């Protein structure tokens, strides 16, 4: 049961260095091709290359000249490099892997949003929504950056009836919501939380939904 | 370069019927006795999820409902029968040449019943007014088809202008869309008006639906 | 390392036949074919093999020429040439493909190479 | 067969000094797009990756070499030439079968 997870910055300025780790649990990297994988904001996928399991590399001809892909067999990660960066390289990166049985990328990492951009870290302001059988209640993610934002209700235990929406981008600012339904028998009687963070400032915030 | 042509762009199945997807390459990804097309799933906020691969091979694990075939330089995969959890992107990726690329992608609609928005407005929070921010929100939720216009008024009146909005990918147990409408004022300007009105149009109704509130 | 090591230099009679080997090591010899060339002064490639299946692929200058199979069991890919003339005396080289598909299908990794002489 | 890819090699052969620049081109008589490989073979020893896919350096060649082409025109740069390089060259292509080399280009 193979497992693959990226980590590395999630803003980058242009003409700098991008920098990526992918950490490897349960196969060893010394089997297999190990690949980097990006898509793009308009969903685009590119494939970017790999690092094999003997050490050879593969570098997609467009990015031939600008990617390096290492590895520490001792443990177990490899790494990619893009070099001089521009808005353009502005992605979700994925590393997934290759085994012979199939020849496919065949297990893939959640993938780690990467920004270029020159706009600064700010922190999100979040604002209930309150106003039947049902009733819907939300949380307003303002103006944060860059992306991502995670949203939760009631810690994840409210899962069914959640709308989050994609995240608008206003000003070089975010602005993203989520909305609730639930039945009006258990709110305001049972609490209604929204749990909002945002890695790249360390925000979390618990907002209880509150009757006016 | 090897391109790999994915089509329709787009299409929309109902439930328990056939999807059939077609991808073309430019040149011939056959090499030692294998097409080296492979075909994935994608959901949003998701990676891409290996269905078929080596052109004909159920990945392990993945329904039999999809299936794929083809050689050289035409392809097809087919979901037979569409169920809800199908609403995703579909790629194709190649491997044989130099250098290894994507289809466009095709995104697969599931065509189920129309129904109308549920629409909610909500007043902004005394936290974003003590803030000095006034932030009117407006929810259009599980609604199909995905075509949907919002308007927003205030007193009577229509406003363009301070308004931002965000629309969801299909839902993948209901098959609905939603939208999310946010009309951004000063707390200044917010209260100098009394009501505040968002209507939506959509194909389920010859009047818009509306929701309201007085401050 | 991966290494290729083939068999020692061959004196052949004309219109007799000899078969070559490479028995190879350091990576999965099933899960990679093995392509055979010949050198007078220029480079020719003779054909493929798949060690998994036994399939092969030969370059039409060739078909009548060489015959390739493998032995699973003791990683060996063979060579044999038939009936030959002054135009066979050559150095003979295995070589593994660098990577899987037709993009992977470099030769990356050589044997020493064979001498056959025709007298 | 007629519909056999050649790769054509230039120059024969050639002399320079230690620490010079010389290139050598490869044409194909049909687009290979970028499958096409560098050896370096010294006398008595088999032919030794050098470039692959046009321009991709194999593990451990130095930087003084380089690959660069598409299509039909491929051209491998030695830079800084040492006596180690003191050797024949030839290309490769894996596009189509059969595979075909250049004819060698000997620097000495």
């Known amino acids: 049961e193979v497992q693959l997870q990226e980590s590395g910055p999630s803003l980058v300025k242009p003409s700098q260095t991008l920098s990526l780790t992918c950490s490897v649990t349960?196969?060893?990297?010394?089997?297999?091709?190990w690949n980097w994988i990006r898509k793009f904001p308009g969903n685009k996928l590119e494939y970017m290359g790999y690092?094999?399991?003997?050490?050879?590399?593969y570098y997609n001809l467009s990015l031939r000249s600008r990617i390096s892909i290492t590895r520490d067999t001792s443990k177990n990660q490899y790494y990619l490099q893009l070099n001089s960066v521009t808005t353009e390289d502005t992605a979700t990166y994925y590393c997934?892997?290759?085994?012979?049985?199939?020849?496919?990328?065949?297990?893939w990492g959640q993938g780690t949003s990467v920004t270029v951009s020159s706009a600064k870290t700010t922190p999100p302001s979040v604002y209930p929504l309150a106003p039947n059988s049902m009733v819907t209640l939300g949380c307003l993610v303002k103006g944060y950056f860059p992306e991502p934002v995670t949203v939760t209700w009631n810690s994840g235990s409210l899962s069914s009836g959640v709308h989050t929406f994609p995240a608008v981008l206003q000003s070089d600012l975010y602005t993203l919501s989520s909305s609730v339904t639930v039945p009006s028998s258990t709110w305001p009687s049972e609490t209604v939380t929204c749990n909002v963070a945002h890695p790249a400032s360390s925000t979390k915030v618990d907002k209880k939904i509150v009757p006016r | 370069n090897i391109v790999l042509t994915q089509s329709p762009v787009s299409l929309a199945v109902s439930l328990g019927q056939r999807a059939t997807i077609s991808c073309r390459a430019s040149?011939?990804?056959?090499?030692?006795?294998?097409?080296?097309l492979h075909w994935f799933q994608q959901k949003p906020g998701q990676p891409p999820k290996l269905l078929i691969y080596?052109?004909?091979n159920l990945n392990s694990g993945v329904p039999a409902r999809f299936s794929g075939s083809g050689s050289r330089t035409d392809f097809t995969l087919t979901i037979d029968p569409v169920e809800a959890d199908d609403a995703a992107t579909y790629y194709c990726?190649?491997?044989?040449?130099?250098?290894?690329?994507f289809g466009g992608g095709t995104k697969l609609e599931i065509k189920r019943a129309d129904a109308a928005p549920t629409v909610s407005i909500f007043p902004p929070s005394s936290e974003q007014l003590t803030s000095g921010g006034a932030s009117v929100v407006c929810f259009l939720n599980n609604f199909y088809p995905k075509d949907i216009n919002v308007k927003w008024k205030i007193d009577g009146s229509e406003r363009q202008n301070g308004v931002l909005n965000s629309w969801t990918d299909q839902d993948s147990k209901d098959s609905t869309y939603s939208m999310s409408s946010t009309l951004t004022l000063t707390k200044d300007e917010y209260e100098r008006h009394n009501s505040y009105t968002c209507e939506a149009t959509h194909k389920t109704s010859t009047s818009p639906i509306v929701k309201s509130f007085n401050r | 390392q991966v290494q290729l090591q083939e068999s020692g230099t061959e004196l052949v009679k004309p219109g007799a036949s000899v078969k070559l080997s490479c028995k190879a090591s350091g990576y999965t010899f099933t899960n990679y074919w093995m392509h055979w060339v010949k050198q007078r002064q220029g480079l020719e490639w003779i054909g493929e093999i798949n060690p998994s299946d036994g399939h092969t692929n030969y370059n039409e200058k060739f078909k009548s020429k060489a015959t390739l199979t493998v032995d699973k069991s003791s990683s060996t890919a063979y060579m044999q040439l038939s009936s030959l003339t002054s135009e066979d005396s050559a150095v003979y080289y295995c070589a593994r493909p660098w990577a899987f598909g037709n993009y992977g299908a470099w030769f990356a990794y050589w044997g020493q190479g064979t001498l056959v002489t025709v007298s | 067969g007629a519909s056999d890819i050649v790769m054509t090699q230039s120059p024969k052969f050639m002399s320079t000094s230690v620490g010079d620049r010389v290139s050598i081109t490869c044409k194909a008589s049909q687009n290979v797009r970028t499958a096409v490989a560098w050896y370096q073979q010294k006398p008595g020893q088999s032919p030794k990756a050098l470039i692959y896919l046009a321009s991709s350096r194999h593990t451990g060649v130095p930087d003084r070499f380089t690959g660069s082409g598409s299509g039909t025109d491929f051209t491998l740069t030695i830079s800084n030439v040492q006596s180690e390089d003191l050797a024949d060259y030839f290309c490769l292509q894996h596009w189509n079968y059969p595979y075909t080399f250049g004819g060698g280009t000997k620097l000495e």
């Open positions: 997934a892997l290759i085994t012979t049985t199939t020849y496919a990328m065949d297990y």
């Open positions: 349960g196969d060893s990297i010394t089997s297999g091709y």
């Open positions: 690092i094999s399991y003997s050490g050879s590399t």
């Open positions: 040149e011939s990804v056959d090499g030692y006795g294998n097409s080296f």
């Open positions: 080596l052109a004909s």
């Open positions: 990726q190649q491997n044989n040449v130099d250098p290894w690329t």
